[PDB]
Ligand binder design. Structure first.
Ligand code: XG4
Ligand code: MG
Ligand code: MG
Length: 342
DNA sequence: TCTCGGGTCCTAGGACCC
DNA sequence: GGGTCCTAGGACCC
C-alpha cells in the first residue's frame, strides 16, 4: 500500500529566469520585489544575495541595508508563467497525477507509473534533467511515500539536487524533525508548541491525541498524524480557483476618501479583466473590499452579490471607510470576489 | 528594515431552516 | 436542539 510521491520545486524561481534571460545577473546579487519607495518586499532572491541575508518576504528597505549593491527587478510574470506551463507539460509526459501548488511547484504520484523500471528516484532525476535541458533552469525534488515528506525532501539538497526517503528511513527522519518544517506549522504555531515543550515530531509522538485535539482542534489531529509519518492526502489534479482579488499598497499612507476612491477606480478595471478571463459573463457568488491601516489592522467587507459591479464596491468601501478607519492612514485598498461553486 | 499580492483552509456567532 | 448559510478574521504558503 505504499505510494511514490515526488515534489518538484524550481530553484530560486523568479530570479533563475531573470538570470537565464540576462546573464550579467548571474554572479551579482539580485532580487525581484518592490522598491523601498513603493514600500515593497522581496519576492525572491538569488544565491549571491541570500548570502547577505536576503529572503522572500523581507522588506526591501531591510534587503538593501543588508546588501547595498542589490539589483532590484520588478519581475515579469508572463515569463514565469511561460516557464511554469512548460514544466507542467514536462510532468505530464510522465503522469497525469499532477497537483500544482504554484507556478514553480507540483506533486506527482508515480506509484502506478512504468517510466524508469518504476523508479521514483530515476523519474525525478529525469524530470530535473529535461527541465534543465529545454528551459536552462534547474529544479530540485524530494521523493517519499506521502506528500509532506516529499516536500520536505525537496529542500534538503537544493539547489539542483534531490533527496529520497524510503519507508524504512521515515522513522529516523521523524525523530528529530522540527515541527516547524511541517507545512501548515508556521511562526505562531511553532511558538505555541515550543511553549508546551514540543519542538520535534519525536516529542509529539509521546503525546496524547485527545490533548492535541483540545489545545488545537483539527490542526492537532494533523500534527499527531504528521509526526507519525501519516499523510493520506491524495495528489489531486482537479483543484480550481475559488476567488480573485486585487489590492495595491500606496507609497504614501492616505487620509481622505477622495484619494481612496481614486484608488478603487484604478483597481476595478484590473479586477474586471482578470475575472473576465475565467468567467466572461462576470458572474460570481460574492464581491467585497479590503482596507489595511497605518498600524496593520485589516478588515474586509464582503457580501452576496450576483455580478461584478463597480459602484457597489465603491459604496461598501465608503461605508467601511466611514465606519472602521477612525482617523488612521490607509496603506492599502483591495477588491475581491468569491467565485460560484461548481 | 518596517513590513506585497496572489491565494488556501479553518474557526466561530447569529440567522435561518426543520 | 441540530444542520448549513452568512460574514469576518487569522494563520499560513508561494
Ligand atoms: N510575492 C511573493 N512571492 C513569493 C513569495 N515567496 C515566493 N514567491 C514567488 C517567488 C519565488 O521565486 C516563487 C517560488 O517560491 P519558493 O519556491 O518559495 N522560493 P524560490 O523558488 O524563489 O526559492 P527556492 O530555491 O528556495 O525554491 O514564488 C512571497 O512571500 N511573496
Ligand atoms: Mg522554488
Ligand atoms: Mg515553490
Amino acid at each position: 500500500g505504499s505510494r511514490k510521491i515526488i515534489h518538484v520545486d524550481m530553484d530560486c524561481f523568479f530570479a533563475a529566469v531573470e538570470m537565464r534571460d540576462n546573464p550579467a545577473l548571474r554572479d551579482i546579487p539580485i532580487a525581484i520585489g518592490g522598491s523601498r519607495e513603493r514600500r515593497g518586499v522581496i519576492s525572491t532572491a538569488n544565491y549571491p544575495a541570500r548570502k547577505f541575508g536576503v529572503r522572500s518576504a523581507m522588506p526591501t528597505g531591510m534587503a538593501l541595508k543588508l546588501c547595498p549593491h542589490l539589483t532590484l527587478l520588478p519581475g515579469r510574470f508572463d515569463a514565469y508563467k511561460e516557464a511554469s506551463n512548460h514544466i507542467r507539460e514536462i510532468f505530464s509526459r510522465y503522469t497525469s497525477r499532477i497537483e500544482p501548488l504554484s507556478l514553480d511547484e507540483a506533486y506527482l504520484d508515480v506509484t502506478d507509473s512504468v517510466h524508469c523500471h518504476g523508479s521514483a528516484t530515476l523519474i525525478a532525476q529525469e524530470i530535473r534533467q529535461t527541465i534543465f535541458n529545454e528551459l536552462q533552469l534547474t529544479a530540485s525534488a524530494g521523493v517519499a511515500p506521502v506528500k509532506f515528506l516529499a516536500k520536505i525532501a525537496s529542500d534538503m539538497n537544493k539547489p539542483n539536487g534531490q533527496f529520497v526517503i524510503t519507508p524504512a528511513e521515515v522513522p529516523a527522519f521523524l525523530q528529530t524533525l522540527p515541527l516547524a518544517k511541517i507545512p501548515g506549522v508556521g511562526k505562531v504555531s511553532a511558538a505555541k508548541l515550543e511553549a508546551m515543550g514540543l519542538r520535534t515530531c519525536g516529542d509529539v509522538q509521546k503525546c496524547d491525541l485527545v490533548m492535541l485535539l483540545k489545545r488545537f482542534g483539527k490542526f492537532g489531529r494533523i500534527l499527531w498524524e504528521r509526526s507519525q509519518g501519516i499523510d493520506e492526502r491524495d495528489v489531486n489534479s482537479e483543484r480550481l480557483r475559488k476567488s480573485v482579488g486585487v489590492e495595491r499598497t500606496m507609497a504614501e499612507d492616505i487620509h481622505h476618501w477622495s484619494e481612496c476612491e481614486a484608488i478603487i477606480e484604478r483597481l476595478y478595471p484590473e479586477l474586471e479583466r482578470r475575472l473576465a478571463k475565467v468567467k466572461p459573463d462576470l458572474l460570481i457568488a460574492r464581491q467585497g473590499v479590503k482596507l489595511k491601516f497605518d498600524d496593520f489592522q485589516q478588515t474586509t467587507q464582503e457580501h452576496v452579490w450576483p455580478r461584478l459591479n463597480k459602484a457597489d464596491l465603491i459604496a461598501t468601501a465608503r461605508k467601511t471607510w466611514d465606519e472602521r478607519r477612525g482617523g488612521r492612514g490607509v496603506r492599502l485598498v483591495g477588491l475581491h470576489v468569491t467565485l460560484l461553486d461548481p
